[PDB]
Amino acid sequence: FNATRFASVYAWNRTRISNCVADYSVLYNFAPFFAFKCYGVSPTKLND
């Protein structure tokens, strides 16, 4: 989330996230979202 040189769409820089506990409040507090739509999981249900 706190990158400075996000790669362009023609590269779509993807990162592998493993061996950590995914807390979504750190994701929330960094970005004042404009599109937080979800398809497979509920936005409210991510910490469980």
Partner: protein, 96 residues
């Protein structure tokens, strides 16, 4: 039903909901236009982190089968050993 919910240039009349605070109870309606809250911002409007609860179910005559305007009606009964207001064609004989 692709002949009643489709026309040239499209038809975005229908609606459906993707954003609600909690699950829907069985046989309980929830018609309302309340913008879903993302986080703790009380935003009342469209755009950033405050989304409209319902989006268009837009239909056009040329979609895929999984995207065709399917018409669905459900029928619900409460069958048991009880009186009835709905019956079937059957004549009544005489008592002996």
């Amino acid at each position: 039903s692709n002949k009643l919910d489709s026309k040239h240039s499209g038809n975005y009349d229908y609606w459906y909901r993707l954003f609600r605070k909690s699950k829907l109870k069985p046989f309980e309606r929830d018609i309302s236009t309340e913008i879903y809250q993302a986080g703790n911002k009380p935003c009342k409007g469209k755009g950033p982190n405050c989304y409209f609860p319902l989006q268009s179910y837009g239909f056009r005559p040329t979609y895929g089968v999984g995207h065709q305007p399917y018409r669905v009606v459900v029928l619900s009964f409460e069958l048991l050993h009880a009186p009835a207001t709905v019956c079937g064609p059957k004549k009544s004989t005489n008592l002996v």
